[PDB]
Design a protein around this ligand. Structure first.
Ligand SMILES: CC(=O)N[C@@H]1[C@@H](O)[C@H](O)[C@@H](CO)O[C@@H]1O
Ligand SMILES: CC(=O)N[C@@H]1[C@@H](O)[C@H](O)[C@@H](CO)O[C@@H]1O
Ligand SMILES: CC(=O)N[C@@H]1[C@@H](O)[C@H](O)[C@@H](CO)O[C@@H]1O
Ligand SMILES: CC(=O)N[C@@H]1[C@@H](O)[C@H](O)[C@@H](CO)O[C@@H]1O
Ligand SMILES: CC(=O)N[C@@H]1[C@@H](O)[C@H](O)[C@@H](CO)O[C@@H]1O
Ligand SMILES: CC(=O)N[C@@H]1[C@@H](O)[C@H](O)[C@@H](CO)O[C@H]1O
Ligand SMILES: CC(=O)N[C@@H]1[C@@H](O)[C@H](O)[C@@H](CO)O[C@H]1O
Lengths: 406, 6, 410
């Protein structure tokens, strides 16, 4: 069986609990989550810091988790990630469309650019995991269940996962999981990974690239490689002088969208009004135009916990050792599961040839909730970035590039 | 710029 | 025998008369003639500006003018020949004979109108319009063509002066993409007219460093009469060769695509009047300045504008020492017309120039600079008051056009 080909019947979805044109609605759903989550994540940061992440990655990991969710935990999930808006009736049908969307995203003949995904589960070597849950995850998400000794070797295990994530991200996403995040009590770790690399449909020439002092808000300046190029691009300066520039990759199915507010204007004002529709708006008012493009040759890495923002967004049960409800995962062994924490880590690199972005999400069951990590470095004059799949209307990566000095 | 003279 | 690759021995000048002037990695001589033409430009520009009101815009092409009279000098003799040599500073090329200036001018011209695989357009066209009835000196005809590419088109000034006038006018128009039209005033040119010498220059280039139309905005421009007016201000930030000179005067160089030609702007501080700077603008001073420019990050404020100027060169030149050439009694141009008529003199000399500056040149573009944070203490250049403008061919150190923007308003 190949979910990509099958109909919403050739798949014996047996979720314990419950609560085409649909695919689209799902993408809408994901985008809704994205902007919202971005905004929250935005607050937990300095307006002048870098921010990068794959919303899709997160939406995937938590969808995967939901296969074993139940009661409120299940409902909250559905709503928090807006799946509850997909014209359906069963929390179990959503998964079918997600599989489809993933099919269309990573399974194409053309392949002018590389866009792959890889999901995996890591359960304690001594527990018996419910078979249907195990089978569904491997079918709907290509997520096989790998055994790991959490009870006697939490560390070996963590290092294990981080490395598996490393292999799926060409070594770009390494330490997705913080140090003391996994312990003897850890029951399972759900993981998603996404990897991208596309060639600019119009590369930049290195000769045109020049160094240029970049001024850090509070501080001095650091060297920066600014690229230069002239050509036709779908562009548009909108309200308040904000610019929306679209950079297509070979094939045109995946583009990078830049958003920069007028000089002296603050980006924070834009972020508070960011929405799927708002974004769609700009995406429409774009027109082919001859413009000169100055853009830094850079790369940014970002990592963080998602529990905080997610709780604020509505996900409460799942993280509560008391209220969490994930019966469908473990059949016999150690139940009364809850998510200790959830981590994400993304990477973006841009140059003359094109762009390279990678990300990963890891949800941890019954582990230790490591205190929110952090790595600051205020910069200045940031701009928003987006790498989306146009046909599918999917925001694969998004973020705020603030420091071009890398 | 476009300049001419005679 | 291509003159552009020819040795002086390959181009016999055999001029009617001769005069002996008294006392990097390019051509030593074209470098010198370049210095020459510039000494004339500044001196002549000073004179010209002094005779003009401070709120008047000014534009002309010293190169065109130097080229015209250099063409005339070919048949000049005695005191007319000297005065020409002296006035147009050619005599300032130590111990060089009046006829060498022409081989040099030949070399200078080759470099300037290279026509190579370039992006900016710089064209020149010289032509002699003589009366079909007259018989011009062969050598004069020959050399005028070999060194300046000027052809001798016969016209009927005796009978159809007016028809002949339109012919000239129409030709200049064509050579100047129609920006320069009725070069010649109807009044001039008549049956008595025997020769009309004409030199045209035409340049069009794109900014090597674009000004986004999207940023062009109205701003007040402050005239020299203490008043203000609304002008279109172009805006952009970037690296340009710049330099803050004496008494806060700001010098800026905006290059065109190709890098061979630039536009230099001289902007005095609001306190100081441009008239002061013009009176001090010495050839050696303008040299020092140009050589001192250094790459830098600055905010550029510069108005769009079109300038059309036209004037007689006669008076100015006379004041500068060119008299015989205009005297029916003192003129000496034996080398031009053959057989009698020897006492030919220049009845008049006119110059008409055009200038248009803006984004694009040739409403359709935009610029997007992502991830840029310039120094909050960066230097700015706001051209909202009168300033000087030059359009030079750097490698050759030649001033093709110069002028003054005393009022870009509308
Ligand atoms: C007995 C057994 O192991 N089967 C159960 C079934 O009773 C239950 O209704 C279903 C949930 O829909 O999960 C399993 O299939
Ligand atoms: C509110 C609650 O926890 N009880 C119900 C339980 O009776 C029912 O069998 C199950 C099926 O989805 O849903 C809930 O778990
Ligand atoms: C093995 C176990 O714990 N029993 C239940 C039972 O309903 C069925 O086996 C499955 C179907 O969802 O869910 C759980 O596994
Ligand atoms: C100007 C010119 O063509 N040179 C000759 C000159 O050599 C010769 O001596 C003279 C008559 O003797 O006729 C010409 O002037
Ligand atoms: C003032 C004048 O006309 N006489 C001399 C003439 O005798 C001499 O041969 C010639 C040479 O350049 O110069 C002058 O023309
Ligand atoms: C055609 C004519 O009049 N002959 C003269 C000739 O005597 C003189 O040597 C030469 C040098 O310029 O110029 C010619 O015009
Ligand atoms: C390109 C253009 O429009 N300029 C024309 C040119 O095509 C024509 O060859 C010439 C007459 O020969 O007249 C110019 O004005």
């Amino acid at each position: 069986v190949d979910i990509c080909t099958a109909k919403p019947r050739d798949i014996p979805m047996n979720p314990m609990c419950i609560y085409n044109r649909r695919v689209w609605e799902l993408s809408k759903a994901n985008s809704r989550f994205a902007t919202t989550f971005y905004q929250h994540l935005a607050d937990s940061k300095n307006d002048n810091d870098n921010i990068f992440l794959s919303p899709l990655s997160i939406s995937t990991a938590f969808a995967m988790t939901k296969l074993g969710a139940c009661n409120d935990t299940l409902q909250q999930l559905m709503e928090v990630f807006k799946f509850d808006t997909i014209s359906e009736k069963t929390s179990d049908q959503i998964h079918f469309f997600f599989a489809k969307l993933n099919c269309r995203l990573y399974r194409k003949a053309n392949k002018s650019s590389k866009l792959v995904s890889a999901n995996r589960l890591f359960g304690d070597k001594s527990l018996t995991f419910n078979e249907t849950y195990q089978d569904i995850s491997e079918l709907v998400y290509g997520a096989k269940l790998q055994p790991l000794d959490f009870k006697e070797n939490a560390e070996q295990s963590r290092a294990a996962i981080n490395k598996w994530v490393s292999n799926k991200t060409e070594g770009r996403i390494t330490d997705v999981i913080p140090s003391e995040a996994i312990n003897e009590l850890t029951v399972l770790v759900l993981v998603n990974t996404i990897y991208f690399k596309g060639l600019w449909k119009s590369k930049f020439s290195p000769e045109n690239t020049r160094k240029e002092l970049f001024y850090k808000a509070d501080g001095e300046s650091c060297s920066a490689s600014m690229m230069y190029q002239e050509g036709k691009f779908r562009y548009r300066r909108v309200a308040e002088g904000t610019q929306v520039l679209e950079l297509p990759f070979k094939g045109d199915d995946i583009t990078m969208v830049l958003i920069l507010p007028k000089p002296e204007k603050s980006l924070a004002k834009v972020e508070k009004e960011l929405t799927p529709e708002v974004l769609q708006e700009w995406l429409d008012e774009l027109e082919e135009m001859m413009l000169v493009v100055h853009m830094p040759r850079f790369r940014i890495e970002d990592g963080f916990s998602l529990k905080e923002q997610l709780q604020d967004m509505g996900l409460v049960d799942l993280f509560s050792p008391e209220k969490s409800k994930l019966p469908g995962i473990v059949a016999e062994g150690r139940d009364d599961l809850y998510v200790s924490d959830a981590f994400h880590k993304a990477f973006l690199e841009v140059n003359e040839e094109g762009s390279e972005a990678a990300a990963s999400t890891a949800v941890v069951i019954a582990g230790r909730s490591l205190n929110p990590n952090r790595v600051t470095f205020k910069a200045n004059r940031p701009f928003l970035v987006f790498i989306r799949e146009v046909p599918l209307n999917t925001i694969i990566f998004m973020g705020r590039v603030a420091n071009p000095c890398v | 710029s476009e300049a001419a003279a005679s």
